[PDB]
Amino acid sequence: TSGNLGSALHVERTQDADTTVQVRNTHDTGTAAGARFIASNEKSGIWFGISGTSNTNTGLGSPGDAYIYNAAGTATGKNLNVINNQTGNIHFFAGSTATGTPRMTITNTGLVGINTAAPLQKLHVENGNMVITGTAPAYQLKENDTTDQNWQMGINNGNLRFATQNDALNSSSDKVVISQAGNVGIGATAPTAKLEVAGTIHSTSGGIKFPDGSVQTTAASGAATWTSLGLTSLGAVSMTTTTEQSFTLPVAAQTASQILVYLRCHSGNASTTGADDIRIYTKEGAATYDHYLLMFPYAGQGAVGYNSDSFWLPKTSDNKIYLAHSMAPGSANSGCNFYITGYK
Amino acid sequence: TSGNLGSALHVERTQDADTTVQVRNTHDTGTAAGARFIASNEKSGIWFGISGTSNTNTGLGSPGDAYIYNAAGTATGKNLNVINNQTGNIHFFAGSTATGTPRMTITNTGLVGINTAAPLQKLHVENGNMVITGTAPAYQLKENDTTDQNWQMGINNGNLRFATQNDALNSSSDKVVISQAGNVGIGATAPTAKLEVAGTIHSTSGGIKFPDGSVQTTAASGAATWTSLGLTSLGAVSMTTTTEQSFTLPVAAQTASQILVYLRCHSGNASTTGADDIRIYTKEGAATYDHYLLMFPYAGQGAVGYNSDSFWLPKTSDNKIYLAHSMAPGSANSGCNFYITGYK
Amino acid sequence: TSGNLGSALHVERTQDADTTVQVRNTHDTGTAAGARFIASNEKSGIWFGISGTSNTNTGLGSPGDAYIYNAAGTATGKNLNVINNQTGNIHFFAGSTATGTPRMTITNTGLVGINTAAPLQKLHVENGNMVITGTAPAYQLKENDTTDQNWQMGINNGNLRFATQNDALNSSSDKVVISQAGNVGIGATAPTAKLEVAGTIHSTSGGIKFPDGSVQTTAASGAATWTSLGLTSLGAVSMTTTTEQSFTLPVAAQTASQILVYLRCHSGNASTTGADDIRIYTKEGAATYDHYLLMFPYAGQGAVGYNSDSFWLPKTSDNKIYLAHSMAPGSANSGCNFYITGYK
Ligand SMILES: [Cl-]
Ligand SMILES: [Cl-]
Ligand code: NA
């Protein structure tokens, strides 16, 4: 050996010039003219050449085109393999020599760049857009470590559709839609509102701003109208005790948030004298919700005093309402009538 | 014929070895050295070769590179056609022999795979990402069966923009935006809220959860303040009938949801005796909304009883409010005054 | 010269036919059989040929395949350059001759079409889908005029993730997520609601529709329960003036929206006679919020009249509440007690 690291037909000439094997045909008018090299076996073959400037064989291309043609012959299923056993790239230059920008590049590590020789991802389009077309084209994302939990962004009937997809990529399930109108739907598919959500909407912080006056809300709801019950008595009121009196709410209101009650009292020639702050209230455990009505009996008087109030109380879990005299007025010539008149 | 299914220069040798035509140039230092085959017509030609390891002709590549070069000559508009007339693939291998993973594959049915020989879509990037770059690069989706109802996902000024697009792909109309801040806007373009929607937001089910206390709301709105009208009388109250009395609401409140009213009554030496549950109410068709005030005249008495209440009633479509004595108290030494004092 | 615009081995024949240089090997059974052209220098070389139908050299492909093979030799880092110095295209045809649809096209201006010879963008997939696969594959959009303000649509654990990204494409920050469940989150990452927004939600117009009854809301919030204070006196009421009396709200309610107050009055043998419309109100600048309670003293009477009311008033910025007699009733045998009983 020498340690110096450097055929049926062999053409060799050492020179500061291309050593060239040329095939040539200058016939400018023959429909079948051309020049080409062919490598073949007994079944098929591969051709490398250029057609004449009047060549009509569209199987190879247009007149004057160049071609690399792997023929059919009697062979089937054959590949054409383009192989760079090198750490360089495969460069495709079109409309320039190699001094131009490579239109496409396949690096030695598998990356593919369009309009860039240095791709950053497996496919990288430099300084340009991408488009896909069809009757329902979709950009799909297939996750390999999971099973049938894939995604896609597609178009259908002008609606941009974000849909899940299976590992076979053939059973989409629309989850989000945006129409040409600009309306978005999440679980809806014909979004009429600017944003329809077929489900609960949650503000984790901040709450909800409104458009008429930029109203900011982070609470709940209220009311405006109510169901009347007329003068539905809650029971007899004792006039002789200052202890707590309970009353059971009508079944109809046992499902309400608020109840409206009416308390009326009168006193003529009473058996006591003094100010009775009647307390009306509902209970949620320790908490109470409290209203008062004044009843001032004056013993012996030849007249009749009277008072009433109508007010709202929270409807609580125990379905009761309570009443308590601060001073027992007495039943003599006096009265106290307690009614539930509405609920909501 | 035989049924056995199997040139200006013809090189044939049947053998268990490559039959080879070789051109060769070992000049390692010439700036113009190389070896190549050329097929040409009278206008242009195509070269297949390798340059010398000191070749400086950058039109073909870097020193020592291999090349397929379709020349310009005097020909214009010509194609280079790479043709596999076979049901196999076109394989591009870079950095390996054919025993490696094909970097790119073009199947016989038109599918293109990067890093996979078995693509599932027309373009399929196996085990890698895709990126597009520019000053406003966009992934576009063109629908062919429709006319100018296309979509795209682009970037502009750090904002991810989902915009409709025409079949010419040159007139985007932003519909959704997400900023680097993380804010989303639907019909807005400078989203300040975490989610701005230039239009109605609809919860089809579930309603709306809140962040302070996880409040869940599926209703509407209420109030807190109101417009005062002072003591604006609603009209004279008859003291002599138990039939329904109507009164017309002031024009100012005819647009409100609720009205606040004040009813006062007094009775001295009256002409009747008994409990009068005065009923004050508003009407929506069959429905009524009802309050009561007690008035207990006592004939002959040398004193004056008095009562009043101030309360809210729904403002209804007929713009009226009504009053009804359960017992006519009489006008003698007595009075009933009815006022609308506010609305909201 | 003539103005007419039209080698170590030179093969030329002008004819209406291909002028052909052929190399051929019909050995159908040799594991090493093949036919090929080779261009080489002293380090490496490039081969163009076809393998025998029993050729086992997988480095070139499968038996009978055709190949363009840029060899390793003693050369490193070398490119294979495919160059069309023409305004035409580079066409890749697979499964057809050039009369078919080009599977891939590289135009002279750099555009790349799959299944189309006339691409509209730098990369254009005609009548087909695109898919990317991996353990977390992403479609990325890199903006060049800005610095580290890029976007991407990826998949991770079945969740479609819209995340910002840097110009190095290696530090994603999830901003929007959609789960296989169909739930969307903006700033959340495990969306439980159909739409979670970790921040304020803004309706620029239209407001908010609801699902139970299609309720439409564009306002704010209300209440239902409240904090009781019992009978907490607001101060002494003067009985001798019709001028405005102020009272300071308890510190506990100075942070509330509404306050609930209780006013009681009684009158026996008074020193005046007439109707006193006691006015109770809160102030926001010019605006007042007004309730009234009737007190009708009757001088000399041998009885005691009484009245009370309990009602809600807006809690205003000045933390005061006010009271005003329309006629001073007098302190003789009479009383007026004013309490704040609740707030919310
Ligand atoms: Cl009275
Ligand atoms: Cl009262
Ligand atoms: Na009274």
mmCIF file of N, CA, C and O in Angstrom, chain A residues 22 24-25 32 34 38 40-41 59 79 81 83-84 86 89 91 93 95 131 133 138 140 142-144 151 202-205 209-211 217 219 267 277 290 294 301 307, chain C residues 9 11 16-17 19 21-24 65 68 70 78-80 82 84 98 126-127 129-130 132 134 139 157-158 195 197 199 201 203-204 219-221 228 262 264 304 306:
data_model
loop_
_atom_site.group_PDB
_atom_site.id
_atom_site.type_symbol
_atom_site.label_atom_id
_atom_site.label_comp_id
_atom_site.label_asym_id
_atom_site.label_seq_id
_atom_site.Cartn_x
_atom_site.Cartn_y
_atom_site.Cartn_z
ATOM 1 N N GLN A 22 -19.484 13.517 -23.993
ATOM 2 C CA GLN A 22 -20.622 14.262 -24.524
ATOM 3 C C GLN A 22 -21.374 13.451 -25.568
ATOM 4 O O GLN A 22 -20.765 12.766 -26.398
ATOM 5 N N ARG A 24 -24.589 14.329 -28.394
ATOM 6 C CA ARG A 24 -25.070 15.571 -28.984
ATOM 7 C C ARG A 24 -25.885 15.303 -30.247
ATOM 8 O O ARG A 24 -25.579 14.389 -31.022
ATOM 9 N N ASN A 25 -26.947 16.092 -30.433
ATOM 10 C CA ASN A 25 -27.816 15.993 -31.632
ATOM 11 C C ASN A 25 -28.303 17.410 -31.932
ATOM 12 O O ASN A 25 -29.037 17.952 -31.100
ATOM 13 N N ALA A 32 -38.655 13.793 -33.121
ATOM 14 C CA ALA A 32 -38.106 12.729 -32.289
ATOM 15 C C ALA A 32 -36.644 12.957 -31.926
ATOM 16 O O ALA A 32 -36.018 12.060 -31.345
ATOM 17 N N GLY A 34 -33.187 14.098 -30.139
ATOM 18 C CA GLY A 34 -32.761 14.289 -28.767
ATOM 19 C C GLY A 34 -31.376 13.725 -28.566
ATOM 20 O O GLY A 34 -30.783 13.133 -29.470
ATOM 21 N N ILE A 38 -28.262 6.330 -21.422
ATOM 22 C CA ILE A 38 -29.182 5.315 -20.911
ATOM 23 C C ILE A 38 -28.377 4.254 -20.185
ATOM 24 O O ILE A 38 -27.379 3.757 -20.715
ATOM 25 N N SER A 40 -29.278 0.491 -18.559
ATOM 26 C CA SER A 40 -30.388 -0.457 -18.576
ATOM 27 C C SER A 40 -29.955 -1.851 -18.140
ATOM 28 O O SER A 40 -28.788 -2.238 -18.283
ATOM 29 N N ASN A 41 -30.929 -2.604 -17.610
ATOM 30 C CA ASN A 41 -30.872 -4.047 -17.463
ATOM 31 C C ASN A 41 -31.849 -4.690 -18.458
ATOM 32 O O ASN A 41 -32.242 -4.067 -19.454
ATOM 33 N N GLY A 59 -44.163 12.730 -23.035
ATOM 34 C CA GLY A 59 -43.832 11.855 -21.924
ATOM 35 C C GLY A 59 -42.587 12.295 -21.180
ATOM 36 O O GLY A 59 -42.452 12.030 -19.985
ATOM 37 N N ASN A 79 -38.141 1.969 -7.493
ATOM 38 C CA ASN A 79 -37.893 3.298 -6.961
ATOM 39 C C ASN A 79 -36.853 4.014 -7.810
ATOM 40 O O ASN A 79 -36.057 3.393 -8.522
ATOM 41 N N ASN A 81 -33.923 6.445 -6.529
ATOM 42 C CA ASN A 81 -33.274 6.831 -5.283
ATOM 43 C C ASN A 81 -32.207 7.879 -5.564
ATOM 44 O O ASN A 81 -31.292 7.647 -6.361
ATOM 45 N N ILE A 83 -29.331 9.903 -3.728
ATOM 46 C CA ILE A 83 -28.558 9.572 -2.534
ATOM 47 C C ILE A 83 -27.329 10.467 -2.448
ATOM 48 O O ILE A 83 -26.474 10.434 -3.341
ATOM 49 N N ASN A 84 -27.220 11.247 -1.371
ATOM 50 C CA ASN A 84 -25.989 11.980 -1.075
ATOM 51 C C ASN A 84 -25.341 11.365 0.159
ATOM 52 O O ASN A 84 -25.699 11.697 1.294
ATOM 53 N N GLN A 86 -23.040 11.948 2.111
ATOM 54 C CA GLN A 86 -22.165 13.059 2.477
ATOM 55 C C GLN A 86 -22.834 13.845 3.588
ATOM 56 O O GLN A 86 -24.056 13.812 3.739
ATOM 57 N N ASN A 89 -25.437 18.923 1.899
ATOM 58 C CA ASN A 89 -26.856 18.988 1.604
ATOM 59 C C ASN A 89 -27.152 18.473 0.204
ATOM 60 O O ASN A 89 -26.262 18.288 -0.627
ATOM 61 N N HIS A 91 -29.144 20.276 -2.643
ATOM 62 C CA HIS A 91 -29.604 21.617 -2.973
ATOM 63 C C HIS A 91 -30.375 21.562 -4.279
ATOM 64 O O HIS A 91 -29.916 20.942 -5.242
ATOM 65 N N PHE A 93 -31.622 24.255 -6.942
ATOM 66 C CA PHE A 93 -31.527 25.592 -7.510
ATOM 67 C C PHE A 93 -32.354 25.654 -8.789
ATOM 68 O O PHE A 93 -32.148 24.843 -9.696
ATOM 69 N N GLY A 95 -33.811 28.658 -11.636
ATOM 70 C CA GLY A 95 -33.720 30.052 -12.028
ATOM 71 C C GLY A 95 -32.417 30.724 -11.648
ATOM 72 O O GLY A 95 -32.339 31.953 -11.641
ATOM 73 N N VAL A 131 -50.006 27.486 2.131
ATOM 74 C CA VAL A 131 -51.437 27.346 1.890
ATOM 75 C C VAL A 131 -51.745 25.890 1.585
ATOM 76 O O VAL A 131 -50.944 25.187 0.964
ATOM 77 N N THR A 133 -55.226 23.639 0.112
ATOM 78 C CA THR A 133 -56.500 23.824 -0.564
ATOM 79 C C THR A 133 -57.251 22.504 -0.658
ATOM 80 O O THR A 133 -56.666 21.424 -0.557
ATOM 81 N N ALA A 138 -57.235 20.580 5.885
ATOM 82 C CA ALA A 138 -56.969 20.722 7.308
ATOM 83 C C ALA A 138 -55.483 20.578 7.603
ATOM 84 O O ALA A 138 -54.798 19.748 7.000
ATOM 85 N N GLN A 140 -53.222 19.165 10.304
ATOM 86 C CA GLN A 140 -53.441 18.183 11.395
ATOM 87 C C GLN A 140 -52.204 18.045 12.283
ATOM 88 O O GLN A 140 -51.087 18.229 11.778
ATOM 89 N N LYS A 142 -50.607 15.161 14.801
ATOM 90 C CA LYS A 142 -50.775 13.776 15.319
ATOM 91 C C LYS A 142 -49.805 13.522 16.475
ATOM 92 O O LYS A 142 -48.587 13.633 16.259
ATOM 93 N N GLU A 143 -50.337 13.188 17.652
ATOM 94 C CA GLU A 143 -49.503 12.892 18.811
ATOM 95 C C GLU A 143 -49.249 11.391 18.869
ATOM 96 O O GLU A 143 -50.194 10.591 18.847
ATOM 97 N N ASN A 144 -47.970 11.016 18.934
ATOM 98 C CA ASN A 144 -47.555 9.623 18.801
ATOM 99 C C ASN A 144 -47.509 8.886 20.135
ATOM 100 O O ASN A 144 -47.842 7.698 20.191
ATOM 101 N N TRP A 151 -55.325 16.580 17.019
ATOM 102 C CA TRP A 151 -56.047 17.821 16.749
ATOM 103 C C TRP A 151 -55.938 18.211 15.283
ATOM 104 O O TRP A 151 -55.079 17.720 14.553
ATOM 105 N N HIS A 202 -66.381 30.850 32.921
ATOM 106 C CA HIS A 202 -65.749 31.079 34.214
ATOM 107 C C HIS A 202 -64.742 32.211 34.080
ATOM 108 O O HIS A 202 -63.848 32.147 33.233
ATOM 109 N N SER A 203 -64.875 33.236 34.914
ATOM 110 C CA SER A 203 -63.828 34.237 35.084
ATOM 111 C C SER A 203 -63.054 33.875 36.346
ATOM 112 O O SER A 203 -63.592 33.959 37.451
ATOM 113 N N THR A 204 -61.801 33.448 36.182
ATOM 114 C CA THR A 204 -61.003 33.054 37.340
ATOM 115 C C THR A 204 -60.597 34.260 38.184
ATOM 116 O O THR A 204 -60.498 34.150 39.412
ATOM 117 N N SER A 205 -60.371 35.414 37.554
ATOM 118 C CA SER A 205 -60.210 36.674 38.267
ATOM 119 C C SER A 205 -60.846 37.778 37.438
ATOM 120 O O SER A 205 -61.292 37.559 36.311
ATOM 121 N N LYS A 209 -66.702 42.523 32.535
ATOM 122 C CA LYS A 209 -66.975 43.943 32.182
ATOM 123 C C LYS A 209 -68.202 44.007 31.264
ATOM 124 O O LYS A 209 -68.457 43.016 30.557
ATOM 125 N N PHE A 210 -68.926 45.129 31.270
ATOM 126 C CA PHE A 210 -70.148 45.256 30.432
ATOM 127 C C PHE A 210 -69.942 46.394 29.429
ATOM 128 O O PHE A 210 -69.050 47.229 29.655
ATOM 129 N N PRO A 211 -70.708 46.460 28.316
ATOM 130 C CA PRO A 211 -70.475 47.461 27.270
ATOM 131 C C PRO A 211 -71.203 48.801 27.451
ATOM 132 O O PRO A 211 -70.636 49.810 27.072
ATOM 133 N N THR A 217 -68.661 43.562 36.752
ATOM 134 C CA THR A 217 -69.458 42.751 37.711
ATOM 135 C C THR A 217 -68.697 41.478 38.095
ATOM 136 O O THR A 217 -68.183 40.804 37.181
ATOM 137 N N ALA A 219 -70.173 39.372 40.799
ATOM 138 C CA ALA A 219 -71.115 38.861 41.829
ATOM 139 C C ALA A 219 -72.122 37.876 41.221
ATOM 140 O O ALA A 219 -71.683 36.975 40.485
ATOM 141 N N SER A 267 -104.429 48.484 68.438
ATOM 142 C CA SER A 267 -104.594 48.454 69.889
ATOM 143 C C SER A 267 -105.584 49.528 70.319
ATOM 144 O O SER A 267 -105.395 50.715 70.034
ATOM 145 N N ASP A 277 -91.427 46.812 70.349
ATOM 146 C CA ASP A 277 -90.700 46.707 69.085
ATOM 147 C C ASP A 277 -90.807 45.260 68.624
ATOM 148 O O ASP A 277 -89.956 44.424 68.947
ATOM 149 N N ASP A 290 -83.539 40.754 60.189
ATOM 150 C CA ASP A 290 -84.407 41.350 61.197
ATOM 151 C C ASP A 290 -85.120 42.595 60.676
ATOM 152 O O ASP A 290 -84.487 43.507 60.135
ATOM 153 N N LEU A 294 -93.434 48.881 65.216
ATOM 154 C CA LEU A 294 -93.774 49.451 66.517
ATOM 155 C C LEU A 294 -95.248 49.236 66.828
ATOM 156 O O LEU A 294 -96.119 49.483 65.991
ATOM 157 N N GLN A 301 -107.341 53.800 76.807
ATOM 158 C CA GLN A 301 -107.617 54.860 75.846
ATOM 159 C C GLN A 301 -108.894 54.580 75.051
ATOM 160 O O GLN A 301 -109.250 53.429 74.767
ATOM 161 N N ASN A 307 -100.865 50.088 63.073
ATOM 162 C CA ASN A 307 -99.598 50.157 62.361
ATOM 163 C C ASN A 307 -99.484 48.920 61.482
ATOM 164 O O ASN A 307 -100.122 47.897 61.736
ATOM 165 N N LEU C 9 -14.466 12.653 -25.083
ATOM 166 C CA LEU C 9 -15.220 11.651 -25.822
ATOM 167 C C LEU C 9 -16.477 12.331 -26.329
ATOM 168 O O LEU C 9 -17.261 12.850 -25.531
ATOM 169 N N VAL C 11 -19.805 12.124 -28.989
ATOM 170 C CA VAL C 11 -20.720 11.264 -29.739
ATOM 171 C C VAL C 11 -21.791 12.160 -30.341
ATOM 172 O O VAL C 11 -22.709 12.587 -29.632
ATOM 173 N N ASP C 16 -33.386 12.729 -36.811
ATOM 174 C CA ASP C 16 -34.714 12.781 -36.204
ATOM 175 C C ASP C 16 -34.914 11.566 -35.296
ATOM 176 O O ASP C 16 -35.801 10.733 -35.487
ATOM 177 N N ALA C 17 -34.049 11.478 -34.291
ATOM 178 C CA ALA C 17 -34.094 10.390 -33.328
ATOM 179 C C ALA C 17 -33.140 10.722 -32.198
ATOM 180 O O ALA C 17 -32.251 11.565 -32.340
ATOM 181 N N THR C 19 -30.023 10.535 -30.220
ATOM 182 C CA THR C 19 -28.638 10.080 -30.249
ATOM 183 C C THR C 19 -28.275 9.617 -28.841
ATOM 184 O O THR C 19 -28.314 10.411 -27.893
ATOM 185 N N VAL C 21 -26.093 7.255 -25.868
ATOM 186 C CA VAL C 21 -24.982 6.497 -25.297
ATOM 187 C C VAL C 21 -25.566 5.559 -24.252
ATOM 188 O O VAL C 21 -26.201 6.014 -23.292
ATOM 189 N N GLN C 22 -25.372 4.255 -24.431
ATOM 190 C CA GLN C 22 -26.016 3.275 -23.560
ATOM 191 C C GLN C 22 -24.990 2.369 -22.895
ATOM 192 O O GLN C 22 -24.016 1.946 -23.526
ATOM 193 N N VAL C 23 -25.215 2.073 -21.618
ATOM 194 C CA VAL C 23 -24.499 1.016 -20.922
ATOM 195 C C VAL C 23 -25.547 0.029 -20.422
ATOM 196 O O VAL C 23 -26.645 0.436 -20.029
ATOM 197 N N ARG C 24 -25.227 -1.266 -20.482
ATOM 198 C CA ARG C 24 -26.252 -2.291 -20.343
ATOM 199 C C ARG C 24 -25.673 -3.575 -19.752
ATOM 200 O O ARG C 24 -24.531 -3.951 -20.041
ATOM 201 N N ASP C 65 -33.947 -1.135 -8.805
ATOM 202 C CA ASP C 65 -34.145 0.298 -8.660
ATOM 203 C C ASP C 65 -33.102 1.092 -9.442
ATOM 204 O O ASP C 65 -32.015 0.605 -9.780
ATOM 205 N N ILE C 68 -29.254 7.762 -8.303
ATOM 206 C CA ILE C 68 -28.261 8.811 -8.427
ATOM 207 C C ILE C 68 -27.525 8.839 -7.096
ATOM 208 O O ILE C 68 -28.115 9.188 -6.068
ATOM 209 N N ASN C 70 -24.211 9.973 -4.956
ATOM 210 C CA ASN C 70 -22.997 10.745 -4.738
ATOM 211 C C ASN C 70 -22.205 10.040 -3.643
ATOM 212 O O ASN C 70 -22.652 9.958 -2.499
ATOM 213 N N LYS C 78 -19.576 17.195 1.286
ATOM 214 C CA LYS C 78 -19.872 17.598 -0.080
ATOM 215 C C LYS C 78 -21.376 17.651 -0.335
ATOM 216 O O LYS C 78 -22.168 16.951 0.305
ATOM 217 N N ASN C 79 -21.766 18.524 -1.255
ATOM 218 C CA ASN C 79 -23.163 18.685 -1.620
ATOM 219 C C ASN C 79 -23.455 17.934 -2.910
ATOM 220 O O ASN C 79 -22.559 17.644 -3.710
ATOM 221 N N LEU C 80 -24.731 17.613 -3.099
ATOM 222 C CA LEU C 80 -25.270 17.289 -4.411
ATOM 223 C C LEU C 80 -26.188 18.435 -4.809
ATOM 224 O O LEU C 80 -27.167 18.721 -4.110
ATOM 225 N N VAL C 82 -28.647 20.205 -7.575
ATOM 226 C CA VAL C 82 -29.539 20.021 -8.705
ATOM 227 C C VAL C 82 -29.934 21.409 -9.172
ATOM 228 O O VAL C 82 -30.572 22.157 -8.419
ATOM 229 N N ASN C 84 -31.366 24.046 -12.218
ATOM 230 C CA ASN C 84 -32.027 24.395 -13.476
ATOM 231 C C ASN C 84 -31.783 25.872 -13.760
ATOM 232 O O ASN C 84 -32.499 26.740 -13.253
ATOM 233 N N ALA C 98 -44.321 12.594 -18.002
ATOM 234 C CA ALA C 98 -44.518 14.032 -17.868
ATOM 235 C C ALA C 98 -45.907 14.482 -18.291
ATOM 236 O O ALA C 98 -46.246 15.648 -18.075
ATOM 237 N N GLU C 126 -51.836 21.267 -3.050
ATOM 238 C CA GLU C 126 -53.095 21.355 -3.830
ATOM 239 C C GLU C 126 -54.014 20.168 -3.547
ATOM 240 O O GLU C 126 -53.558 19.024 -3.691
ATOM 241 N N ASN C 127 -55.257 20.442 -3.157
ATOM 242 C CA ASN C 127 -56.259 19.362 -2.966
ATOM 243 C C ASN C 127 -55.751 18.300 -1.992
ATOM 244 O O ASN C 127 -55.920 17.106 -2.294
ATOM 245 N N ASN C 129 -54.417 17.515 2.501
ATOM 246 C CA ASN C 129 -54.164 17.941 3.871
ATOM 247 C C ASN C 129 -52.669 17.954 4.182
ATOM 248 O O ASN C 129 -51.830 17.451 3.428
ATOM 249 N N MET C 130 -52.344 18.535 5.332
ATOM 250 C CA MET C 130 -51.003 18.463 5.888
ATOM 251 C C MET C 130 -51.084 17.922 7.303
ATOM 252 O O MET C 130 -52.026 18.238 8.033
ATOM 253 N N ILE C 132 -48.427 16.984 10.828
ATOM 254 C CA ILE C 132 -47.144 16.872 11.502
ATOM 255 C C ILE C 132 -47.346 15.989 12.718
ATOM 256 O O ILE C 132 -48.393 16.052 13.370
ATOM 257 N N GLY C 134 -45.395 13.743 16.211
ATOM 258 C CA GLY C 134 -44.314 13.703 17.180
ATOM 259 C C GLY C 134 -44.866 13.431 18.570
ATOM 260 O O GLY C 134 -45.984 12.944 18.724
ATOM 261 N N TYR C 139 -46.961 23.665 14.787
ATOM 262 C CA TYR C 139 -46.871 24.585 13.659
ATOM 263 C C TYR C 139 -46.445 25.950 14.191
ATOM 264 O O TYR C 139 -47.171 26.564 14.987
ATOM 265 N N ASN C 157 -50.372 16.260 25.302
ATOM 266 C CA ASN C 157 -51.286 15.500 26.148
ATOM 267 C C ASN C 157 -52.727 15.705 25.698
ATOM 268 O O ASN C 157 -53.619 16.005 26.496
ATOM 269 N N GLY C 158 -52.944 15.554 24.393
ATOM 270 C CA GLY C 158 -54.254 15.741 23.812
ATOM 271 C C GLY C 158 -54.764 17.162 23.817
ATOM 272 O O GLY C 158 -55.821 17.420 23.236
ATOM 273 N N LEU C 195 -65.639 27.208 29.143
ATOM 274 C CA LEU C 195 -64.709 28.288 28.838
ATOM 275 C C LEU C 195 -64.251 28.907 30.152
ATOM 276 O O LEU C 195 -65.037 29.564 30.838
ATOM 277 N N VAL C 197 -61.554 31.635 31.765
ATOM 278 C CA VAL C 197 -60.750 32.807 31.444
ATOM 279 C C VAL C 197 -60.123 33.293 32.743
ATOM 280 O O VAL C 197 -60.821 33.832 33.611
ATOM 281 N N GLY C 199 -59.004 35.824 34.011
ATOM 282 C CA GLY C 199 -58.982 37.265 33.880
ATOM 283 C C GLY C 199 -60.351 37.787 33.500
ATOM 284 O O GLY C 199 -61.321 37.040 33.377
ATOM 285 N N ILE C 201 -63.545 39.217 31.631
ATOM 286 C CA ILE C 201 -64.265 39.013 30.381
ATOM 287 C C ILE C 201 -65.058 40.277 30.083
ATOM 288 O O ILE C 201 -65.791 40.774 30.943
ATOM 289 N N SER C 203 -67.654 42.288 27.385
ATOM 290 C CA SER C 203 -68.544 42.399 26.234
ATOM 291 C C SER C 203 -68.534 43.857 25.791
ATOM 292 O O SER C 203 -69.027 44.729 26.509
ATOM 293 N N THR C 204 -67.952 44.126 24.622
ATOM 294 C CA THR C 204 -67.876 45.504 24.140
ATOM 295 C C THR C 204 -69.243 46.026 23.704
ATOM 296 O O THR C 204 -69.528 47.219 23.863
ATOM 297 N N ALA C 219 -75.874 44.683 32.587
ATOM 298 C CA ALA C 219 -75.824 45.565 33.782
ATOM 299 C C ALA C 219 -74.802 45.053 34.806
ATOM 300 O O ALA C 219 -73.672 44.740 34.396
ATOM 301 N N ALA C 220 -75.193 44.973 36.082
ATOM 302 C CA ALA C 220 -74.242 44.562 37.146
ATOM 303 C C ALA C 220 -74.899 43.596 38.137
ATOM 304 O O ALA C 220 -75.626 42.691 37.678
ATOM 305 N N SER C 221 -74.678 43.784 39.447
ATOM 306 C CA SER C 221 -75.161 42.782 40.440
ATOM 307 C C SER C 221 -76.130 43.361 41.476
ATOM 308 O O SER C 221 -76.289 44.597 41.514
ATOM 309 N N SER C 228 -77.090 41.807 59.868
ATOM 310 C CA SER C 228 -77.918 42.518 60.836
ATOM 311 C C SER C 228 -77.057 43.251 61.863
ATOM 312 O O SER C 228 -75.998 42.764 62.277
ATOM 313 N N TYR C 262 -84.529 51.634 60.532
ATOM 314 C CA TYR C 262 -85.808 51.502 61.212
ATOM 315 C C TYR C 262 -86.104 52.825 61.899
ATOM 316 O O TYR C 262 -85.304 53.289 62.713
ATOM 317 N N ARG C 264 -89.130 54.690 64.129
ATOM 318 C CA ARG C 264 -90.376 54.587 64.868
ATOM 319 C C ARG C 264 -90.690 55.926 65.509
ATOM 320 O O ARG C 264 -89.783 56.655 65.921
ATOM 321 N N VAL C 304 -102.512 57.430 72.251
ATOM 322 C CA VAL C 304 -101.162 57.450 71.707
ATOM 323 C C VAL C 304 -101.183 56.874 70.297
ATOM 324 O O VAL C 304 -101.463 55.685 70.112
ATOM 325 N N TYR C 306 -99.054 55.860 66.813
ATOM 326 C CA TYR C 306 -97.725 55.311 66.610
ATOM 327 C C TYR C 306 -97.554 54.896 65.157
ATOM 328 O O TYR C 306 -98.526 54.573 64.471
#
